[PDB]
Structure 1
Amino acid sequence: LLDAHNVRVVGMGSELVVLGHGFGTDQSVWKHVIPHLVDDYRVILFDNMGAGTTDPEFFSFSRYSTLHGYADDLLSILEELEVESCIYVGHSVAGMVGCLASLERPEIFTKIITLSASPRYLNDRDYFGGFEQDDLNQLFEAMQSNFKAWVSGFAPLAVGSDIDSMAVQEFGRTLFNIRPDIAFSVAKTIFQSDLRIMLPKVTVPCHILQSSKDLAVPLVVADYLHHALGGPTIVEVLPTEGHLPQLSSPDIIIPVLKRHLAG
């Protein structure tokens, strides 16, 4: 592999840091953040399977029907790279994927930093995730009725900000580039996932980073992960709007992510 996930390892720093991305983008979501990590950290970047920068020959609809397929990829990349010990930074579902990987090898991860991560988008009894199943059905029907019109309305809500903003236009490009059946299946694997039962067995320290205004992750989800993760945790709410604040507001995320990387 490595070439299969477009693994790039840049930097000269002492500490290893792995950067993961969420649905609809790729490792270029960190493009504004990387140059501020190279001096103090050795940065490891990779693309999730199914992304627009990825060959559909390697995407298995059965392997990625659960988030275990994404966690096995992460553990397989760290094995090939001979990673003994690193900090893992995970955006959106990749933050939960990093927690799922720490269940199998907790000694690899000294620290987990989650950005806009949620263990479950579905509401439930005494759990506010944000979405009802009829909200999911309409998003799954609209995604299959007109995939391009769905992207045009999903990207400004996901990133926040204006439709003429550069970040919204770039996320829309990367999201549109996912093959529509692959995008439909991955969106079903992600929006219907429920990782609340694995949280108390996570023993890796997690720094829970969250935007104050995130439409896919309510602010109370950051507090749920604060009490339910079994390892030592801390929460920092970012003064940003949107689910991809490292893309649309990098100048705010850089100092906060840097302080949590060293603390």
Structure 2
Amino acid sequence: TLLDALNVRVVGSGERVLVLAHGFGTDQSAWNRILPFFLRDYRVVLYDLVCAGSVNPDFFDFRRYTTLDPYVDDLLHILDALGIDCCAYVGHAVSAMIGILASIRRPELFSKLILIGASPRFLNDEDYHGGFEQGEIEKVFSAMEANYEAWVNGFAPLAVGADVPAAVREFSRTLFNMRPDITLFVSRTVFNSDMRGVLGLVKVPCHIFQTARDHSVPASVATYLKNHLGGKNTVHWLNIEGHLPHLSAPTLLAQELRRALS
């Protein structure tokens, strides 16, 4: 029933497992345009985080999903249920972190992690530039709660960054699918987490995919990850603007994935 609730799907003609894990505001459909590049060499595993608008909101238990741990639990449950003993993992934003944490708990499960638009911490402090001040973040939450639609319309073009209208709409609609309720709660969960202290525990190689002008991830956060993740790290400086390259420049992003995977 968890595989059903989280919309777990296994496609492709290959034998090597590749899992694609969406970030906040989207669901697994965000990979639709990447997918074709991997169907013939891989067994591709996709799923939706509980907070995706495509998952029954009855399954979003506010007394459970207060931190990333249960998200990790869900991932690890999927992989065990599918009988996966080793895979390559691609995670966008929050799913980058979920991947990190999963790898630490089950290092045998991952051959490689690929992180797209990852950050261990959004908030600035003494010696760390995360991109956001405590004030800023709060004004986001009050904008979201006051008028959810107005917020989506102002946030989506910024998240996409580049002028790709089709992408803005697609991101808009998956944000709109989410119950405003949950979007608020999940955002709190994320903007307030500090993953910095875990990075050194990672031992699996990580490829850090970083776009130009990512509104939620400064260029230095990519370097920081490269410097702190405890395994062998490669940074991929994408010639793409925005935080959602899988929606905005899918052919370009797929080519880099293919390269990172070899």
Same fold (TM over 0.5): yes
Matching of residue 4 in structure 1 with residue 1 in structure 2? no
Any idea what the Cα deviations from partners look like across 1:7-28, whole Å, max 9, x if unmatched? 1110111311010000000011
1:251 matched residue in structure 2: 251
Distance 2:197 2:162 in 1: 34
- DSSP 3-state at the match of 1:64: coil
Distance 1:236 1:113 in 2: 10
Distance 2:229 2:64 in 1: 26
Distance 1:194 1:226 in 2: 16
Contact 1:161 1:168 in 2 (8 A): no
Distance 2:157 2:82 in 1: 36
Distance 1:246 1:170 in 2: 11
Any idea what the Cα deviations from partners look like across 1:116-143, whole Å, max 9, x if unmatched? 0111111112111000011100000000
- DSSP 3-state at the match of 2:5: coil
For the aligned residue pairs, the C-alpha RMSD in angstroms reads: 0.9
Matching of residue 32 in structure 1 with residue 30 in structure 2? no
Number of equivalences: 261
Distance 1:63 1:106 in 2: 25
2:211 matched residue in structure 1: 211
Contact 1:159 1:167 in 2 (8 A): yes
Matching of residue 50 in structure 1 with residue 42 in structure 2? no
Distance 2:239 2:19 in 1: 24
Structure 1 vs Structure 2: percent identity of aligned residues? 55
- DSSP 3-state at the match of 1:103: helix
2:202 matched residue in structure 1: 202
Distance 2:124 2:134 in 1: 8
User: Where in structure 2 are there 5+ consecutive unaligned residues?
Assistant: none
Distance 1:63 1:197 in 2: 23
After superposition, where does 1:1-263 map in structure 2 within 5 Å? Answer: 1-162=2-163, 165-262=165-262
Q: Which has the higher helix share?
A: 2
Any idea what the Cα deviations from partners look like across 1:201-250, whole Å, max 9, x if unmatched? 01111010110110100011000000100111100110111110011111
Distance 1:196 1:175 in 2: 28
- DSSP 3-state at the match of 2:90: strand
What is the deviation of 1:261?
1.2
Q: TM-score, normalised by structure 2?
A: 0.98
Distance 2:227 2:12 in 1: 34
Contact 1:142 1:150 in 2 (8 A): yes
- DSSP 3-state at the match of 2:18: strand
Distance 2:126 2:86 in 1: 38
AA aligned opposite 1:191: F
Any idea what the Cα deviations from partners look like across 1:164-206, whole Å, max 9, x if unmatched? 7010011011011111111100011111111111100011110
What is the deviation of 1:161?
2.7
AA aligned opposite 2:219: L
